[PDB]
């Protein structure tokens, strides 16, 4: 048993960390990326996992699988499954009451339970950890949403087992983020912690109470279908209209063109969290026509103004459910790359009358960070 690792198995991307020599190290994958898309794809000749999968989605949409976390621990008949499957290009089928994703792989029809798909992502995370450490990785803490039920938790454990991991503990994502910031190292009176978690595809607000290192989930709120991708999409539509003006062509039905634009918009979003201008640079976007343009932070904000303001409604609901006034929150913790958005941070701070945010740990890494901390404690290394 080498060091144990912490794995954030995310809806759209995943992240693995390890506690070593008094520090957490977030581990870059085989593409040099500190997060890995929760994607798997199948071609005539192979199975792709992570960046390779994500990067060929437009070329191979029916055999590229994502959002397995939406299915994990579910039954086919579930209202969530029935609704969600309407917006996936891959097939979901009923196996005796349990959903399976069905794809073509090497010209053959194959199908996989959600935890089998997730097991492939966990295998990727294990492998990148092993490549970094230069030794075997067996023990892990794996995180899940606080709202996950017993079935969802057990299926997640099953994904780990399938990947050859000994899952030391299933830990809640907000709890992991709080552990990252050492909020359970505070000694004294009860403390109320709000986690504001805006991922690629979901938005979670959680309120925890911590006392003597002991966590209680007081309330959860959010929107399981709101995330950074929504903000990217607003930019995408903006640029489709721009291309139409400038080049008198509508790229809307070309999946490859839209995908390359989407990728550019995602990059632009990140850029705009640190600078006031970002470029869109796409050689041969459509019919050989180049698209080189740019956008300001202000314009990005305007395009998304309603969605940004809308993030405070779940914050209000969570406080209501927890029977807490906004003034009773001791700590606000930011999780998810979109929480880097200055306008979001400003909206949140303004809501909390100027209170400062816990944001020094990369918000896309905070969950894996806390998972890594707890893995080291549980394995007897911290
Ligand atoms: Cl995600
Ligand atoms: Na997340």
Swiss-Prot record:
GO terms for biological process: ATP metabolic process; cellular response to starvation; cellular response to steroid hormone stimulus; chaperone cofactor-dependent protein refolding; chaperone-mediated autophagy; chaperone-mediated autophagy translocation complex disassembly; clathrin coat disassembly; membrane organization. It catalyses: ATP + H2O = ADP + phosphate + H(+). It is found in: Cytoplasm; Melanosome; Nucleus, Nucleolus; Cell membrane. ATP binds at residues 10-13, 69, 200-202, 266-273, 337-340. The modification N6-acetyllysine is found at residues 106, 244, 317, 326. One of its GO terms (molecular function) is MHC class II protein complex binding. It is an enzyme of class 3 (hydrolase). ADP binds at residues 12-13, 200, 266, 269, 273, 337. Its main location: cytoplasm. It is a peripheral membrane protein. Acetylated. ISGylated. The modification Phosphoserine is found at residues 151, 327, 360. The modification N6-succinyllysine is found at residue 317. Its EC number is 3.6.4.10. Keywords: Acetylation, ATP-binding, Autophagy, Cell membrane, Chaperone, Cytoplasm, Host-virus interaction, Hydrolase, Isopeptide bond, Lysosome, Membrane, Methylation, mRNA processing, mRNA splicing, Nucleotide-binding, Nucleus, Phosphoprotein, Repressor, Spliceosome, Stress response, Transcription, Transcription regulation, Ubl conjugation. Residues 184-375 are annotated as: Interaction with BAG1. Induction: Constitutively synthesized. Residues 1-382 are annotated as: Nucleotide-binding domain (NBD). GO terms for cellular component: blood microparticle; clathrin-sculpted gamma-aminobutyric acid transport vesicle membrane; cytoplasm; cytosol; extracellular exosome; extracellular region; extracellular space; ficolin-1-rich granule lumen. Ubiquitous. The N-terminal nucleotide binding domain (NBD) (also known as the ATPase domain) is responsible for binding and hydrolyzing ATP. The C-terminal substrate-binding domain (SBD) (also known as peptide-binding domain) binds to the client/substrate proteins. The two domains are allosterically coupled so that, when ATP is bound to the NBD, the SBD binds relatively weakly to clients. When ADP is bound in the NBD, a conformational change enhances the affinity of the SBD for client proteins. Component of the chaperone-assisted selective autophagy (CASA) complex consisting of BAG3, HSPA8/HSC70, HSPB8 and STUB1/CHIP. Identified in a IGF2BP1-dependent mRNP granule complex containing untranslated mRNAs. Interacts with PACRG. Interacts with HSPH1/HSP105. Interacts with IRAK1BP1 and BAG1. Interacts with DNAJC7. Interacts with DNAJB12 (via J domain). Interacts with DNAJB14 (via J domain). Interacts (via C-terminus) with the E3 ligase CHIP forming a 210 kDa complex of one CHIP and two HSPA8 molecules. (Microbial infection) Interacts with SV40 VP1. Belongs to the heat shock protein 70 family. Molecular chaperone implicated in a wide variety of cellular processes, including protection of the proteome from stress, folding and transport of newly synthesized polypeptides, chaperone-mediated autophagy, activation of proteolysis of misfolded proteins, formation and dissociation of protein complexes, and antigen presentation. Plays a pivotal role in the protein quality control system, ensuring the correct folding of proteins, the re-folding of misfolded proteins and controlling the targeting of proteins for subsequent degradation. This is Heat shock cognate 71 kDa protein. It comes from Homo sapiens. The chain holds residues 3 to 384 of 646 of the full protein.
